[PDB]
């Protein structure tokens, strides 16, 4: 019922010690299940207590510090987001304060930037949502513990949607006791939902191998709209609208009034203005989820793209000297397979339509704090060069410009994608071809040939596929991979580079709709 026995739990800790079992062979993909993992608020260190039943898996030895046990953040091998513990014998508890036990199963992680909405959704909310669902009993029972050291931040209400239990910050841990011990704690975050890297080693851009699709993004979005008490019914008909993100701040669209009227007349549709500062986030999601089209300057507010309905168009505007192909966190999100969104990028090419602010503080794009020779190089540069992350002054100077949008220029850019009105399902892969057979042929003066046959993949018997083709590879015992062929039907006989006893390796695979490449069946050795 309500089993609270401090002495028995204390003896389990003093006799048994900490228990650790972790996934992954490297520290960049490691999530750890802990039992009786302890945290000393005085030392600000997690503690592994060695006892009778202690398990350390993996047991890295000195390699536990090369560089650490795991990544507490999803920003991969940062430097400031590592997790590690210090080792003590369980008997050392005799010389330490009486521990305070967390009977809740916990998820311990680091938020990267709780103030930036893009970082909140990409680094924290989506990884937390699916890290919880990796282990049974976490999705609706775990309490989140954020150890990075930031306050609640501007979007803490979003973190509280992930769990019925209120999350805890590191600063709140000292009020519980000098020595905290988690009876059951998971540590780390999955990187599987990430799609973008912020440019700490090479310039920023999309990840090389994105392991998430629009379907998984939209299942998370559907969960969030439910927690925000936003229905999923949609607007009527005739009430469709283009949604334009607005700002009070900076990075403004100076001719917003002209833009709203122009878009409304061009696309024969009402236009609506939305703002993160002037709307509750539930209202933001309510508006975005019916938007037939989303127009916004490049900024963190465009991460709300993941709430858009299928068939909507993202229109991202970039200020003067900002190359859209260099800053694609939202282009990547919108163009993910399964997202069912169209993306459009527009770039202000006209310097007479930009307004700079060189005298602002550094974090608002000001350049007054620099040598006048570097001020001159920035003022004369026509495009922000590629750079490494974070405090690049020319990037900050250009991204904090105000922009007068060239409306005809913008309409042409959108018209290359949206041909009529803006606004509103498959994706399966073939199986192996079955019973692949090949038959050499004796012909004429010992001519050879090769005839290959196969059955349809087993799952094709239940499928609605527009285009079904098959790809066949040949080879020559020990030479480079031969000709590839793409054919329509399950039969064929070959003619080129034939003739006697040669081991011909043949690979066959089925392909659905251009790009859905199925697996290769077992190779066929065909002797002539």
């Amino acid at each position: 019922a309500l089993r609270i026995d401090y002495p028995a739990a204390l003896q389990i800790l003093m006799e048994g010690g900490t228990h650790m079992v972790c996934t992954g062979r490297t520290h960049t993909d490691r999530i750890c299940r802990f039992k009786w993992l302890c945290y000393s608020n005085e030392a600000e260190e997690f503690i592994f207590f060695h006892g009778n039943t202690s398990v350390m898996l993996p047991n890295l030895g000195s390699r536990r510090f090369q560089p650490a046990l795991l990544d507490l953040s999803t920003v991969e091998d940062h430097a400031t987001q590592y997790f590690n513990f210090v080792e003590l014998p369980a008997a050392a508890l005799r010389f330490m304060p009486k521990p305070v036990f967390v009977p809740d199963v916990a998820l311990i992680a680091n938020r990267f930037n709780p103030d930036n909405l893009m970082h909140v959704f990409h680094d924290d909310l989506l990884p937390l949502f699916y890290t919880l669902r990796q282990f049974p009993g976490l999705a609706h029972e775990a309490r989140l513990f954020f150890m990075e050291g930031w306050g609640e931040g501007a979007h803490f209400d979003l973190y509280k949607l992930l769990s019925p239990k209120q999350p805890l910050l590191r600063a709140q841990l000292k009020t519980l006791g000098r020595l905290l011990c988690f009876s059951h704690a998971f540590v780390g975050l999955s990187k599987i939902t990430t799609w973008y890297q912020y440019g700490f080693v090479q310039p920023q851009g999309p990840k090389a191998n994105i392991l998430v699709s629009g379907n998984e993004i939209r299942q998370f979005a559907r969960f969030m709209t439910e927690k925000l008490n936003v229905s999923a019914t949609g607007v009527p008909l005739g009430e469709e609208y283009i949604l334009v993100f607005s700002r009070t701040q900076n990075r403004l669209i100076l001719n917003e009034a002209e833009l709203l009227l122009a878009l409304a007349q061009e696309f024969q549709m009402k236009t609506v203005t939305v703002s993160l500062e002037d709307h509750t986030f539930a209202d933001v999601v309510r508006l975005v989820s019916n938007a037939s089209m989303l127009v916004s300057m490049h900024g963190a507010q465009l991460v709300t793209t993941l709430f858009l309905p299928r068939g909507a168009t993202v229109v991202e505007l970039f200020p003067y000297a900002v190359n859209p192909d260099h800053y694609t966190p939202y282009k990547t999100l919108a163009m993910l397979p399964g997202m069912d969104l169209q993306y459009v990028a527009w770039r202000n090419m006209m310097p007479e339509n930009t307004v700079t602010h060189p005298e602002r503080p550094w974090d608002q794009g000001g350049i007054t704090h620099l040598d006048r020779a570097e001020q001159a190089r920035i003022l004369a540069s026509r495009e922000v060069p590629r750079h490494l992350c974070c405090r690049n002054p020319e990037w900050l100077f250009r991204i904090y410009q105000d922009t007068k949008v060239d409306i005809p220029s913008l309409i042409q850019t959108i018209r290359r994608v949206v041909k009529g009105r803006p606004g509103p399902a498959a994706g399966l892969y073939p199986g192996k071809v079955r019973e692949a057979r090949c038959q050499a042929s004796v012909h004429g003066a010992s001519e050879a040939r090769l005839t290959v046959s196969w059955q349809i993949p087993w799952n094709l018997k239940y499928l609605k596929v527009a285009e079904v083709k098959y790809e066949v590879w040949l080879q020559e015992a020990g030479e480079a991979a031969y000709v590839p062929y793409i054919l329509a039907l399950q039969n064929h006989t070959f003619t080129e580079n034939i003739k006697p006893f040669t081991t011909y390796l043949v690979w066959v695979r089925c392909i659905f709709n251009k790009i859905l490449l199925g697996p290769f069946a077992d190779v066929l050795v065909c002797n002539t």
Partner: peptide
């Protein structure tokens, strides 16, 4: 001696 999920009270 605390095994607490704990509410506050100022």
């Amino acid at each position: 001696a605390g095994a607490g999920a704990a509410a506050a009270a100022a």
